[PDB]
Each structure stands twice: as structure tokens, then as C-alpha cells.
Amino acid sequence: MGPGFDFAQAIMKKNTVIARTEKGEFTMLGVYDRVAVIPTHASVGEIIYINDVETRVLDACALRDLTDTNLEITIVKLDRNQKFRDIRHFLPRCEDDYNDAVLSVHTSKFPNMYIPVGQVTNYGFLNLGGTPTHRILMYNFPTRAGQCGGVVTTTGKVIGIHVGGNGAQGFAAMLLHSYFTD
Numbered sequence: 001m002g003p004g005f006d007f008a009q010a011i012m013k014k015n016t017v018i019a020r021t022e023k024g025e026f027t028m029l030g031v032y033d034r035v036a037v038i039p040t041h042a043s044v045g046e047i048i049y050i051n052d053v054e055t056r057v058l059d060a061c062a063l064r065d066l067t068d069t070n071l072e073i074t075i076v077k078l079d080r081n082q083k084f085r086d087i088r089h090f091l092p093r094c095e096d097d098y099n100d101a102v103l104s105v106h107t108s109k110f111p112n113m114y115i116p117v118g119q120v121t122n123y124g125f126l127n128l129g130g131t132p133t134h135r136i137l138m139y140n141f142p143t144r145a146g147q148c149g150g151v152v153t154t155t156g157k158v159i160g161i162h163v164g165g166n167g168a169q170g171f172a173a174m175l176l177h178s179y180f181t182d
């Protein structure tokens, strides 16, 4: 409906796949080459389904900060025959607060879903499902089961992936440029 939704749609159309693990279906953001991200609670194994294609996982790493605290981001390298558009230049370099963010989801349950979530707080520490977590972004929208892995964007920036909610607020794990240097 406006430039927020336009950027979000462009990221969804070229840089997302539907990932299925034994824990469910997730929006999965492709970042560059065969490298993508997914919430760590997806419990990625040796094999994953990507748009219903059986796919070998070449490498997977659950990120933690240098305090050895969960970040809830798993980086996956996929044995896929096609590279993602490189979007690393849209990733923030530093922890920050944001205005006017969109959360976008694409699954069998929620196809072509875009939610204007508004102001995004650098929340920091969250006890996420009992697990102490750092670098959490917070927004005031009642997000639901099925939106995890959803991409959080502003105009011109890909800032996080949805990892949970409490019924009133939603929470995303930050994406930072430094995660994807090669």
C-alpha cells in the first residue's frame, strides 16, 4: 500500500522460502549464495524441506553472543541448486531502534501476509520460552503461532526475524551484517 510494503514485498518475492522441520513450517530468509536464516527453535537437522523439496543441510550454526547467550538465529547452508539474491547490503551494522516496520510471513497457513507493526524497540534481554536471549527487538502487535521466521523490514533495511510473542507484543532476533561476512 506504500513504500514500506513495497520493500517488504521485494524481499519476500526473491529472498524467502518455506522451510519445514520436525518442529513445523517457517518463513526462511535467504541472505546470499545458499545461506539462509531460521529461528533456532526450528531445530534444523541433516535434512530439511525447502518449498517441499528434500534438501541436505551442508552446515548449520546456532548463534550465541560473546557472553555465550542465545541469539535465537540459526544460519543454514543449503544443498540447493540456485543462489539467493545477495541482500547483505540491506542488513544493519549496529543494534538500533526503528520506526514504521513491517513483518512479512509466507507459509501454507499464512500466504502473502504483511503486518504493519509500527515502532520497534531495542529491547535487549528476553526470557524467550525459558531461554535467556539477547539482541531482541520488540513491537506492539499480537503476533501468533505460524509467524516465526517472519521477516522484519523498514524502508531499505532487513532488521530481524520473528521468534516469539506474549499475546500483546511480538519479538524478533536482530540480523546484523557481521553475521554474514565471508
Ligand SMILES: CCOC(=O)c1cn[nH]c1
Residues within 6 Å of the ligand: 142, 143, 144
Ligand atoms: C486472520 C486474522 O489474523 C489476525 O487477526 C492476526 C494475525 N496475527 N495476529 C493477529
